[PDB]
Amino acid sequence: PPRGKTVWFTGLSGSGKSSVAMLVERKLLEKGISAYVLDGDNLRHGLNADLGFSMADRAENLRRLSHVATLLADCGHLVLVPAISPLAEHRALARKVHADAGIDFFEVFCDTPLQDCERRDPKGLYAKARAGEITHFTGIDSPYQRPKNPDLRLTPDRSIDEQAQEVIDLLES
Amino acid sequence: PPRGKTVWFTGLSGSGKSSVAMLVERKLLEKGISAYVLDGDNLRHGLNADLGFSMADRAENLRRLSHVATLLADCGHLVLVPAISPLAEHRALARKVHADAGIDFFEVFCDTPLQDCERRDPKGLYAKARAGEITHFTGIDSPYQRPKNPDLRLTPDRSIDEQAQEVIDLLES
Ligand SMILES: Nc1ncnc2c1ncn2[C@@H]1O[C@H](COP(=O)(O)OP(=O)(O)O)[C@@H](O)[C@H]1O
Ligand SMILES: Nc1ncnc2c1ncn2[C@@H]1O[C@H](COP(=O)(O)OP(=O)(O)O)[C@@H](O)[C@H]1O
């Protein structure tokens, strides 16, 4: 079967990465197109059980995710990676892993402002951060480096459904 | 798609793990079944680039391989893993990763005597070991713990084609 591709999200916690990724996966699976949401939180229980949450370990999580994505893509899947990916350097690294493998890679920026993400707070992570229960939380006490040249910028005026269709349009362009 | 399954080979260098794995992969793909050979040598260049060859790093290589295999199986592939896997603990841990995930796992022992493996010496690794250019070579220096209860035991009186079909018969059982 033909090589797949990778959509690499980036954005603040609660910006919509997983919501968009999951809906794109469903839309594609409804058409019989193999898609797969590769979420680091899932991998940390198994593949990445050796890692903690130091800065180096967060970078290594993303490095490994980039190689798992290239593997799944080479197996024919449309891979959707909803990681925060806060530093430019590790989005560049992840792209280079894909380019070295011959696999199409798209950087998709969920550009929702902090205030809006914090009002969403779907998992209560912002409430924990503000209470001092989580530190080095991207957007609060650790930096988010905004993508300068993303392939697609998703904005909060558009619905999850609309944004999902924009990702599919990108894939098909 | 229905969940896939993993075939985990084990055996000395030159016993036939890769040859059987690769032919099973071809036979299945020619029937339209989604098979994939997951080889740690390939992964060490990317995913597992951080690992060296200490005993602990060899174990961690296999631990990570077992998770990548479960992931690809959960994505619908028939996964073939041709690793030496010399310690019983390696193979038990790998099985338990699959069982915890709900994925069928088969331990296939390529039981070819050391002398016959050395007469094959397909990549010249035995010739290097005997000249003192390689060390910690399983079956010579470093122990190989023979499977006590494999799902299938492949013997060198059969052809690679015959052995491959025995693996498929196990899968279709
Ligand atoms: N485009 C959107 N329109 C409306 N609500 C959205 C939108 N994107 C996300 N949300 C809401 O915001 C929440 C946070 O989004 P989520 O996908 O969990 O973020 P992330 O995965 O980036 O942490 C979701 O629960 C969802 O209810
Ligand atoms: N059943 C067999 N009959 C004859 N030769 C075989 C058989 N199985 C393997 N071989 C030969 O031995 C070599 C085994 O190498 P390989 O499959 O790379 O072993 P491993 O992966 O176990 O190290 C192959 O080159 C192949 O030519």
Residue numbers in the entry:
A (entry chain A), B (entry chain B): 440 to 612
Question: What did the authors write?
Answer:
The ADP complex crystallized in space group P21 with two molecules in the asymmetric unit. The asymmetric unit of the crystals of the CysC•ADP binary complex contains two subunits, which are related by a two-fold molecular symmetry axis. Manual inspection and analysis by the PISA server suggests a dimeric quaternary structure with a buried surface area of 3300 Å2, with the dominant part of the interface formed by interactions of residues from helices α2 and α3 with their symmetry mates. The ADP binding site in CysC is located in a crevice formed by the loop between β1 and α1 (residues 449–456), the loop 551–562 including helix α5 and the loop region 593–599. In each of the subunits the bound nucleotide was modeled in two different conformations that accounted best for the electron density map. The differences between both conformations are small; the adenine rings are slightly shifted with respect to each other due to a rotation of the glycosidic bond. ADP is bound to CysC in the anti conformation, similar to ADP binding in APS kinase from P. chrysogenum, but different from the situation in human PAPSS1 where both the syn and anti conformation were observed. The adenine ring of ADP is sandwiched between the guanidinium group of Arg559 and the side chain of Ile599. The NH2 group of adenine forms hydrogen bonds to the backbone carbonyl group of Arg597 and the side chain of Gln602. The diphosphate group is tightly anchored to the protein via the conserved P-loop at the N-terminus of helix α1 and the β phosphate interacts with main chain nitrogen atoms of residues 453–458.
